[PDB]
């Protein structure tokens, strides 16, 4: 049992902002698909593809009813009749009730809790409220289990118990497995740094220095500032980690993956196999 939580910039982490729109009740349910087609032809809502246009509602006895999202409200969100909003003969409004104002999510939700707030106002798309599919969650669990095994080998040898795996998501092929190898003689061999060197040494003659372009990293606990920024320089595409680290730079103390003033950004999800990972060592 585990759950992947996006790690977003503080800007993207807050409540979704709302805009005003006009909806109308569908009084004749058998007109729904005709009205949906005619109304959305007139008002495609290009800037808001996340919004479902039909809002179902269930009464205290299980009777299904619907409201239809007509259009965004203008600069003067006054009461409006069907005759004012819907041009004819482009729309035959028969079957609709009187329009009413409703706040709707301005932007798609990204976190599961943003999807909860958003859903309360008007149905929204989202990537069920699942972030990753069953097939996906199973793949992610496999790679992290490999990272955990690497961290456990490290611990058995007396090395810092941190493990990491680099995956090419095109082929779901593992390109590097590594654990912390730091020693008195070589103190900077954190799991992530070992893995970046391994990916580098397997690349061909016509490679750019952005060793991690397009790849996923799974690491048992959240990277330190050195490893995190190394992933920015190497241009990792997504990082999955299990448990945070006290000085971590992908969620805890910094969010170097989600900055506007750095020339590379990437997605970070925390919590994958967290109960296993939480007992391993933090980074550094």
């Amino acid at each position: 049992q585990w759950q992947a939580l996006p790690v977003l910039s503080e800007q993207q982490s807050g409540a979704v902002e709302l805009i005003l729109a006009y909806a109308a009740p569908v009084l004749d349910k058998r007109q729904t698909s005709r009205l949906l087609r005619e109304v959305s032809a007139v008002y495609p809502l290009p800037a808001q593809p996340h919004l479902k246009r039909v809002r179902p509602s269930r009464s205290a006895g299980g009777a299904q009813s619907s409201d239809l999202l007509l259009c965004l409200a203008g600069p003067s969100a006054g009461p409006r009749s069907l005759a004012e909003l819907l041009p004819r003969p482009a729309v035959d409004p028969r079957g609709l009730g009187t329009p009413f104002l409703v706040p709707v999510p301005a932007r798609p939700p990204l976190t599961r809790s943003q999807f909860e707030e958003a859903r309360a106002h008007w149905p929204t798309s989202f990537h069920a409220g699942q972030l990753f599919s069953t097939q996906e969650r199973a793949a992610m669990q496999t790679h992290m289990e490999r990272a955990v095994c690497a961290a456990q080998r490290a611990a058995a040898q007396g090395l810092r118990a941190v493990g990491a795996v680099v995956v090419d998501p095109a082929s779901d092929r593992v390109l590097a497995t590594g654990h912390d190898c730091s020693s008195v003689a070589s103190p900077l061999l954190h799991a992530v740094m070992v893995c970046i060197d391994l990916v580098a040494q397997g690349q061909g003659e016509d490679s750019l220095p952005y060793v991690c372009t397009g790849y996923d990293l799974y690491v048992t606990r959240e990277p330190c500032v050195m490893c995190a920024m190394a992933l920015v320089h190497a241009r990792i595409q997504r990082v999955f980690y299990g448990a945070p680290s006290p000085d971590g730079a992908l969620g805890t103390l910094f969010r170097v993956h989600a900055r506007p003033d750095l020339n590379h950004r990437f997605q970070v999800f925390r919590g994958i196999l967290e109960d296993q990972c939480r007992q391993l060592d933090p980074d550094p």
């Binding site: 970046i196 220095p209 060793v211 500032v225 050195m226 170097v256 750095l262």
Partner: protein, 162 residues
């Protein structure tokens, strides 16, 4: 044994500027750096990212690896060497290298111009002196040394790159 190296600051930074000019000639981010321990250069490096095809091979990372080789080759513990070593680098260390120097417990960095794209001693983040109790020790900085020459090298590089 720290301020004893600072006596030759001009000499060390001149060599660092020389190396930074080489890096520019070789289409690398023009950063040169030297690490000095007891008035002796125990390691040096230029940014070698394009040559090595490896984004982590910043000048400071190259310099650190050379000092660690020196420690290994002469039976010195890195702790006693790095804790009394001064880094001279033409450019404010980036977020990654700042963190690496904290973990090595380098006490002191002398540098030239700001690093506005990636700097970790103030420009983007202040990794150098941030309260990071599990990430080595903060270090102190002497910024601005020959900064005008150093930043002209950066400007030349970023005009030539795609």
């Amino acid at each position: 044994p720290c301020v004893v190296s600072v006596q030759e600051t001009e000499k060390w930074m001149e060599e660092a500027m020389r190396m930074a000019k080489e890096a520019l000639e070789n289409i690398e981010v023009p950063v040169g750096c030297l690490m000095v321990y007891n008035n002796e250069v125990v390691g040096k490096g230029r940014n070698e990212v394009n040559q090595t095809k490896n984004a982590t091979r910043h000048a400071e990372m190259v310099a650190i690896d050379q000092v660690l080789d020196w420690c290994h080759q002469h039976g010195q513990s890195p702790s006693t060497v790095f804790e009394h070593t001064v880094l001279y680098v033409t450019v404010e260390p980036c977020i990654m290298c700042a963190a690496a120097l904290r973990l090595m417990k380098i006490p002191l960095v002398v540098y030239g111009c700001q690093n506005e794209r990636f700097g970790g001693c103030g420009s983007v983040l202040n990794i150098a002196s941030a309260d990071l109790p599990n990430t080595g020790r903060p270090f102190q900085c002497i910024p601005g040394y020959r900064a005008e020459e150093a930043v002209e090298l950066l400007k030349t590089f970023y005009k030539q790159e795609n």
